[PDB]
């Protein structure tokens, strides 16, 4: 799509405002608004300025000015704003040299796609994602010298079966969802059918190609919506826009959505499973009828890369402290580094897809939505490609419930990392696979390590946990 | 003291009940009560039974029965019970062989004192402890699927300067304590003078030899009371009784005390500083007028042991998850493994005591009150003795504010461990210094490692921290 | 008085505890308690240790240990503690050299008295102080990102004339005090007669020699109690003890006292007027029947010193930000640097005392109770002495209501400083008169300047004032 | 003039749009403690006969002599100029480090910690300008804009050279280096005193007259400075209740 295509769309749609969007380092979309009258060729030729020092992982204050240049492929009408608005994603550029920014997440995805082509291994990496989320009714939390709390609430949460009335004072009418029981009974047990339909419609109307929507395992409103896979960059853009649509559909309908990995203790976390495949010249590369689970050598080695690089890879795929609360046994999330067909307890599942070579793929179950899809997707590809290049053989598949393994057998398999600080330490120690072709640069990696330590790891570490009071008040 | 001394005391004091006490593995004293009529020679000769399977770190259910034999040295009159009561500590013994129990904390202390004698290095280890605590007004906390909280409160807490009224509805009269400002302005700013006097009196009346009491640094009622040092076992007994007296004096006066390492975020933790010295034949061994800070070779090598074994030693001296919230810079607790005279930012301080050889000692500032003094003191001695035996040289003292060291300089010094899991892992890997002379046995160490992992580390790890909601709800 | 006098007092009075007191740099008394059994010759010979790094204006953390040595002159029985307690003030000493500490306020007073003797000008400086205070019922305050407040309350406050009920729910019975009308109608208009009697009695029973008590001008419980003058050091010790007695008598009777300079806006502040005189060989030096207001040359030059050094002197006599809210016209506090007999609007008043040479003195009306009487008294003496030494002539007395001066005449007289930052700047620039004889040392002055800037001036400056919202919300 | 008229109308529209939608707007410099204040950055340029005067490809940050001297005027007259650009007591609660407002009198390209930033605008001579970051919305844009112009013009007329640009995070300067650069004023009373003492650059051509300046000084002293000074601050109670 061209600049002239976007102008035509704006004109045809009687757009009043253009929302200029880009991604910060951690993974939150940023925006400012310009009037339709200011949306001209100049925007494409000169770009637009912003304060790079107010954006996380970007610039220092004395080098603040940064530049944005539009990506015409990303233009969509906003489904929410009363004043007709066109949303466009931008690339961050140096204001002097006009070079792409080394710490623009969208640039990383750009570089990743080019690197893939340059290896000759394939020309396209397809990503199918499943970003699960919770539809809550409310949240509050604080952190003070003498105390701290959080509370999430949802009409359908099992913890409310004994409530005398609903939050608004109306009667308790039951049909709440049992812990681990949300997948997926019919209404009225499923209390979110109409809302998810509204999410599905809003996605459709923003040009998503939909596949399914359903309630997920977790009590208190867990959900999943699936849209069609795409190439790496487009898929990352899709993900960001999806979260925006889901969050705001909820918001406008009196609810509140979180994509955090584990908001509920003792119920399912929310993953971002990534179904991945490599294609060259319009033909699939993952399939070999003679391989375990129908997998080719290229596929097997890609898995080998993922599982081998996991200890550092998770710094981008599972980038938060909360991520590691999800990686615990019993909730269909991974606890060790094995692949296995049909296996929802494994780190890499191979879905059952029959003999169609186009459908063959791996499902990397480890990732969650708590970070940056541009970085996450790119990091996975780099790990996968290193696997192919080095012909890294994954350890034999284990076709078992990996949560139920006796302690002695469970030790003879590498575990997923326990906590964020471990993966950050490991990323710091070993990250050469990410710097290949300059896809990730040392300044990006250092900024990432630094940001996570100072803004996440340490702030959590220094604050007493409520359960420590359960454990230790009476020592 | 003899059995007959105890009977005389009971008779003279018109005792109605005898409280039979012993220590569980983690460090909480256990008790049951027998009538005076049942307190006879048979108690000394046969001992008394209890259910070892209900006590933490003791027996399994099918091997439950255990035996207790009294320690006449520990007999004190209870200051609290309306029915006149004599308290006595007991040793845990195997019910078949009558051998001392390998997981009786008091037995470990016993074995430690004997081992010291057997080395010929010294015949007595003196421990002077400072168990800091908070005198709170209230506490509540919970942990649920959809939320969790804690709150401590205290009339003198700075967080309450804005309260319209006190908890009982009476007017806010100010004079609250500023964070880091409780040490130690006169009343009415100090709101606990009369209460601490009651604590001091109760201690005096239980045969403690008192040295001082004061408000400590922390807002919301932090306090310290000091009693005379003693030999290892007696000192550990003194510590347990002291906690009992402090907690129950508070309780009887409408307050609630915690010895947890860090109940307040952004204010001082509570330590258990251990002043330590070795003596032989009634003469002190720590002093040498020509050594740095007046320390002899024996003293220096003891410190060498402490600082060298720190990464595993802290598993007994700093044995909780909350312990590691205290080991942060800015609050007069250690953050790295150095010794230094006069230095309250150091891991081992040498207090200024002049040329009197009897007064020379090291202050090990790392430990807290959150575990077991029997095991903690013993573990310190074993580390200290290994240092003497191997002539371990501590790295040079650093006479500086250790929280304010330039980056290069700081990184050259070994840091204190970050978290409990690290010290437990390290203890598991390397613990030979503790097993010397059979003072700690492998079964004790394995039970400890096992207990901490299953009951403390893991339960905290799996529960989302409220601050993760602050950080991540909107990802 | 001797060590043996104190031991006899403790024994005779059946003392249970000794409260060890000393003064921090800003002017708050500090304390810890030792049992009677620990109060022996050793306390006089060796002294006692404390943490100098937790005391304001004292030591850094790496040089923390400091030493205290008792001052037998200061031993008094505590009127408040249920356990009989003897209070004693200590001097702070270096733990190595045993030299007096350069930043012990009590040492500064000591040094001041010695310097006076060494000049040959006089051998005794007598200080008579009037420390006014407010007896409030309640106070609360806070400071947050989005707001801040304070409120003081008192049953007799004029702002309460329209209250439907008292704070406890009982009826409003009127007889509240008008603004500027508390001095000094009989009860029931004076609602604090019995409470002030208790204050008087507690002072008498602590060996104070009393002169008068009354309600002061301010509404809502302002008060004044006067005790006999004494030499500098004794007077400063008297002041500190007086504050303790006033505050705790109030506290024990359900009230709350503040000595802050200006807690009420539009009503009188609280001063600490200092009546001063110099004596040599038991004869008074202030009187000369032929001088204006019966003042000798020595007296007149002393005044000249005070008024000349005022722009720096106030850094010790008026040491808080709140101090400068009192130095405003219309409330019997000074607004310019003049002396005048009989004149309550002046900076130095000469009280009408007739022809008795022993009664002649100057009243320095500028100082308040918001700081450190040891430092304040000493600083006034140093200014006064520099005046005598340099024969500094004060500008001619102005026998007029100074708040009512014509603009042209007003502008010609030097004003009192506007704010704390001004006097701190001036102290920093010019302070030689304080360093004479080493009474104040550069390290004291630098610490003072630094403390006030970082802990008082700056924190107030950065916080929006509520009146700014009245002024500017709608700009 | 048009710009000042635009500013006044803009405030009216912002305030009343909010009002009509159940909200309430403030343009005060610093209503939140520990979070960003609200500035009124002024991008300035001079033109003659339809051509821009600010640009010179060979100057630091593409700035001409005329531009550089204009900056020199602003930074030189700052101690009095702020009486019109930062005219309230609340103004000075914003001029504190760490919130993208100025704390000293330096210019620097790309620098959001500086008093005058030169925004990155490339080689287009029409786009070159200086951003004076000091001013806020708490006063009078007619007077503020005019005062900045008078300072800027005095700079050109007297060829006042600004001190060398400092291309550093100015909140993070080493103490020794910081102390060598002139600081922004601490409080309103300081700039009013300074305005009273030295204001000739404003009276040039009779743009500001003595009666305006005297009324301004008098108004600020009697209605703003003094009323704040006499009222105890709540934080004084936190500090001093227990003295
Ligand atoms: C949306 C999701 C995650 C369920 C998904 N569906 C698919 C999917 C399912 N069935 C297919 C059948 C035929 C062709 C492509 C298909 C893709 C893929 C995918 C992703 C990457 N590479 C290949 C496939 N992912
Ligand atoms: C109570 C505490 C911790 C303050 C303490 N005082 C002391 C202390 C202080 N001063 C002394 C003076 C003389 C003799 C012994 C002393 C003991 C010691 C101690 C501990 C171990 N070994 C020696 C001393 N510990
Ligand atoms: C208590 C106060 C402040 C009212 C006071 N009374 C006195 C006072 C009042 N009358 C006196 C009559 C005779 C002798 C001494 C006197 C002291 C003095 C004072 C202070 C310093 N030097 C001399 C006097 N101060
Ligand atoms: C039902 S589930 O297996 C549950 C996944 C879980 N929420 C997680 O990945 O953490 N997801 P799917 O079957 O949609 O891949
Ligand atoms: C004043 S402090 O230094 C504070 C110690 C702190 N609570 C800690 O050890 O965490 N203790 P001490 O009584 O040893 O002087
Ligand atoms: C009545 S007053 O003049 C009032 C003094 C005022 N409170 C002050 O701020 O100094 N004091 P005094 O007459 O007791 O010296
Ligand atoms: C992001 S900021 O730098 C913030 C300015 C701040 N509010 C100030 O007080 O000037 N402003 P801009 O980049 O819009 O000029
Ligand atoms: Cl972590
Ligand atoms: Cl842990
Ligand atoms: Cl000030
Ligand atoms: Cl001001
Ligand atoms: Mg799915
Ligand atoms: Mg799913
Ligand atoms: Mg899936
Ligand atoms: Mg201590
Ligand atoms: Mg202590
Ligand atoms: Mg100590
Ligand atoms: Mg008086
Ligand atoms: Mg008075
Ligand atoms: Mg007076
Ligand atoms: Mg700007």
PDB file of C-alpha atoms and ligand atoms in Angstrom, chain C residues 130 273 275 349 363 365, ligand 20:
ATOM      1  CA  UNK C 130      10.099  32.884  78.214  1.00  0.00           C
ATOM      2  CA  UNK C 273      12.315  36.039  74.643  1.00  0.00           C
ATOM      3  CA  UNK C 275      16.501  38.369  79.036  1.00  0.00           C
ATOM      4  CA  UNK C 349      13.077  45.677  74.727  1.00  0.00           C
ATOM      5  CA  UNK C 363      15.162  41.454  76.436  1.00  0.00           C
ATOM      6  CA  UNK C 365      12.562  39.346  71.646  1.00  0.00           C
TER       7      UNK C 365
HETATM    8 MG1  LIG E  20       8.909  38.964  77.489  1.00  0.00          MG
END
